[PDB]
Amino acid sequence: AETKNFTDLVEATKWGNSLIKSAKYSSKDKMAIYNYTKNSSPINTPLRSANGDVNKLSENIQEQVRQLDSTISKSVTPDSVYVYRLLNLDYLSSITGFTREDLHMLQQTNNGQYNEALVSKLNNLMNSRIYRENGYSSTQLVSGAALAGRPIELKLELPKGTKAAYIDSKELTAYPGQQEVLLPRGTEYAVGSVKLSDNKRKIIITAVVFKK
Numbered sequence: 001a002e003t004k005n006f007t008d009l010v011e012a013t014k015w016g017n018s019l020i021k022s023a024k025y026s027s028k029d030k031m032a033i034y035n036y037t038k039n040s041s042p043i044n045t046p047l048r049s050a051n052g053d054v055n056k057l058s059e060n061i062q063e064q065v066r067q068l069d070s071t072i073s074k075s076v077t078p079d080s081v082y083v084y085r086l087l088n089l090d091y092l093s094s095i096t097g098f099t100r101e102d103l104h105m106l107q108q109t110n111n112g113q114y115n116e117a118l119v120s121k122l123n124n125l126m127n128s129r130i131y132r133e134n135g136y137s138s139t140q141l142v143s144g145a146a147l148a149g150r151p152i153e154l155k156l157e158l159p160k161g162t163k164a165a166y167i168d169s170k171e172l173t174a175y176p177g178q179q180e181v182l183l184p185r186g187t188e189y190a191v192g193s194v195k196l197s198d199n200k201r202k203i204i205i206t207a208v209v210f211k212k
């Protein structure tokens with residue numbers, strides 16, 4: 001079978017539920033997922049501040065991280081699939097070579113459309129490079145199901161069998177309807193390209209995730 005790319009919410013929900021069923025979540029699993037979706041800053045900020053080094057975190061946070069790591073690893077993708085991580089322009093401050101001025105100019109769109117030259121520069125700066133998200137990665141099975149107004153769309157191809165938690169169920173998330181797929185902390189992805197969306201109103205960063 002070929003890679004999945006969902007545009008229909010019903011099909012996505014059906015596919016996601018299969019992961020939820022295979023997960024066999026306990027009350028402890030449900031609590032970890034829910035609390036993260038509702039208040040994740042206490043966990044991901046310190047993780048980002050010390051790379052993926054859980055050993056530099058306070059005891060309460062290390063326990064919650066080990067717990068959530070364990071919950072997410074309880075299910076894997078049954079098919080190769082694309083998930084979308086919508087991001088703001090601040091994300092680009094982490095890219096080497098893109099100057100403070102490039103961003104300044106980048107925010108100056110032409111009726112919403114982004115500068116093609118600066119996007120090409122991003123492509124040049126990011127292509128074939130492996131990036132790593134130190135916090136957990138909150139994504140959506142269907143692009144636009146959440147925060148659809150954001151500038152950047154990180155299109156991530158997930159290999160079949162990689163750890164991932166589909167959590168769009170009323171008991172798992174404080175924000176139902178975002179078709180959220182939560183990826184392991186430390187997710188690594190090799191950027192294939194950086195281009196303007198079809199309508200040039202978003203910057204699409206396409207990458208392939210390394211099976212986790």
Ligand SMILES: NC(=O)c1ccc[n+]([C@@H]2O[C@H](COP(=O)([O-])OP(=O)(O)OC[C@H]3O[C@@H](n4cnc5c(N)ncnc54)[C@H](O)[C@@H]3O)[C@@H](O)[C@H]2O)c1
Pocket residue numbers: 036037038040044084085086087088089090091092093094132133134135138139140146147175178179180181
């Ligand atoms: N972002 C999504 O696509 C998405 C999909 C699922 C659900 N929702 C919900 O949104 C809430 C928060 O999600 P979020 O995506 O804003 O969280 P986040 O942790 O990604 O927020 C960090 C913010 O800083 C920027 N950023 C992200 N990673 C960065 C990095 N490595 N370096 C520098 N800047 C970086 C982004 O522009 C982002 O707005 C959660 O409750 C989640 O369940 C979001």
